[PDB]
Amino acid sequence: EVQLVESGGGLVEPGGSLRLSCAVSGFDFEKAWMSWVRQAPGQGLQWVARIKSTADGGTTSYAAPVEGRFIISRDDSRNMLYLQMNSLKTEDTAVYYCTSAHWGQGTLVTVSSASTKGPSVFPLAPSSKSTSGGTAALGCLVKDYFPEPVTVSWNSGALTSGVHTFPAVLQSSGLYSLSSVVTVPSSSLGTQTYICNVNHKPSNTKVDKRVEPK
Amino acid sequence: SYELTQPPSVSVSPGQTARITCSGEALPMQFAHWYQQRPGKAPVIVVYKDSERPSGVPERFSGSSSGTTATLTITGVQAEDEADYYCQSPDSTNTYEVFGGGTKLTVLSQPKAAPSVTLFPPSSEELQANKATLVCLISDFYPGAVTVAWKADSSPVKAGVETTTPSKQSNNKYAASSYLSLTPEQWKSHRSYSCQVTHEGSTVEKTVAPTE
Amino acid sequence: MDVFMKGLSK
Numbered sequence A: 001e002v003q004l005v006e007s008g009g010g011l012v013e014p015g016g017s018l019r020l021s022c023a024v025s026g027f028d029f030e031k032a033w034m035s036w037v038r039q040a041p042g043q044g045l046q047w048v049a050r051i052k053s054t055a056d057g058g059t060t061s062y063a064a065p066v067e068g069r070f071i072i073s074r075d076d077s078r079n080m081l082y083l084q085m086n087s088l089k090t091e092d093t094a095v096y097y098c099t100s101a102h103w104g105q106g107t108l109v110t111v112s113s114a115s116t117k118g119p120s121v122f123p124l125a126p127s128s129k130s131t132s133g134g135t136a137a138l139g140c141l142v143k144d145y146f147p148e149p150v151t152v153s154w155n156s157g158a159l160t161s162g163v164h165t166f167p168a169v170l171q172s173s174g175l176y177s178l179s180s181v182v183t184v185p186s187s188s189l190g191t192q193t194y195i196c197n198v199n200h201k202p203s204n205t206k207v208d209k210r211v212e213p214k
Numbered sequence B: 001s002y003e004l005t006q007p008p009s010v011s012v013s014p015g016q017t018a019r020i021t022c023s024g025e026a027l028p029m030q031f032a033h034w035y036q037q038r039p040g041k042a043p044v045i046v047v048y049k050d051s052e053r054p055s056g057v058p059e060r061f062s063g064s065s066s067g068t069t070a071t072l073t074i075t076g077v078q079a080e081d082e083a084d085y086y087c088q089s090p091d092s093t094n095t096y097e098v099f100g101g102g103t104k105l106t107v108l109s110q111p112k113a114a115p116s117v118t119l120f121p122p123s124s125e126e127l128q129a130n131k132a133t134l135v136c137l138i139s140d141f142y143p144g145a146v147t148v149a150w151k152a153d154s155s156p157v158k159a160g161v162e163t164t165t166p167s168k169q170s171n172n173k174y175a176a177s178s179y180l181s182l183t184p185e186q187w188k189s190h191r192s193y194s195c196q197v198t199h200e201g202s203t204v205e206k207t208v209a210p211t212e
Numbered sequence C: 001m002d003v004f005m006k007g008l009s010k
Helices: B124-128 B184-189
Strands: A003-007 A018-025 A034-039 A048-053 A060-062 A068-074 A080-085 A094-100 A105-113 A120-124 A136-147 A151-154 A164-165 A176-185 A194-200 A205-211 B010-013 B018-023 B033-039 B042-049 B061-066 B069-074 B085-092 B097-101 B103-107 B116-118 B134-141 B147-152 B155-157 B161-165 B174-182 B193-199 B203-210
Touching: A003 A094, A018 A034, A018 A094, A018 B010, A034 A068, A034 A080, A034 B097, A048 A068, A048 A080, A048 B018, A048 B085, A060 A068, A060 A176, A060 B010, A094 A205, A094 B061, A120 A194, A120 B124, A136 A194, A136 A205, A136 B134, A151 A176, A151 B124, A176 A194, A176 B174, B010 B018, B018 B085, B018 B103, B033 B061, B042 B061, B069 B085, B116 B193, B116 B203, B134 B184, B134 B193, B147 B161, B147 B174, B155 B161, B174 B184
Parallel strands: B010 B103
Antiparallel strands: A003 A018, A018 A080, A034 A048, A034 A094, A048 A060, A068 A080, A094 A105, A120 A136, A136 A176, A151 A194, A164 A176, A194 A205, B018 B069, B033 B042, B033 B085, B061 B069, B085 B097, B085 B103, B116 B134, B134 B174, B147 B155, B147 B193, B161 B174, B193 B203
């Protein structure tokens, strides 16, 4: 089966540069005409660049908003595609996809003058107002971080059922916040420990936050 | 320069047949391809070279192309087919690739679900850091439209409010969240704060008070 | 395995 894995996305400031990589497996990469395609939040897909097969001359083509700033290239020996991005603009913020009929998972490019900021993690304690029908809701607030993404697990990933991690809000500040809630039996609250484990890889930060009844 | 035209929306009833069109000048000379993109996931091809079905794609998805229109037909539509569908084709000289605008497909008569609303007051650790956030979480509703209003006592508050767009969840339902940022002094000064969530003529108002 | 873009035209 086919898989494409993009890497290299992250936060960079306007004017900056980045290099995106894509590892291809499962088809004859030597013959493939490969493209980059990007998707800004809530927008449609926007083709970025294409490179033909080496046997067809390896010709590069660019979308007009990126022509002259970006460079697409390929390395047949390693089944690699590359996109070198320069003079980046805030409008280039998007998920970048490597594609040749099949699609990778994408890699997030954030163009912003704002600096990287790890989260402030606060507990959302279960109370009686978050208790109904024998189950209680408790969670963590992951406040004021940048860039995306943040991922949350519970009790080091031993509690995977009944977990609801919400899409992040993008605030007026430019910063993101998100919440993760787990629903648990009410009678376990006195005896079971609950810890949310926040991972913010862009700031190399992990936070384990104990959530205790109020 | 070259553009592929695709209807922004198509809506159908479960089990009947959806047709998504994609119109372009170069389609007589270039292949079109069709992609399904599910909420939060990467596109997956469903039609290759006008009319070929990729392996594993269900039989109900089929494409055809003649003249300046390529068409994706979904027979016996299911709720699970709700997604955005894109066509792709190169220009007449096959120098650059072009995407359609996308077509959001909505399956009608999906059951209405009243939202679960949970409201958290500011944590004590956050208050000691001299901040205050009320967290109003809104889950498992359909259709995907809610309005959030915040109140301090009985008075509406607009400042400090941050509310997400609803996003389609796993079960094709929606979730959203709303955040009211206050100073600890504003938190303590009022008798209560309220998150009021309206959905299809139903209103739910959760209330929290600084003394509880 | 054989579904990728090969630069083919009609």
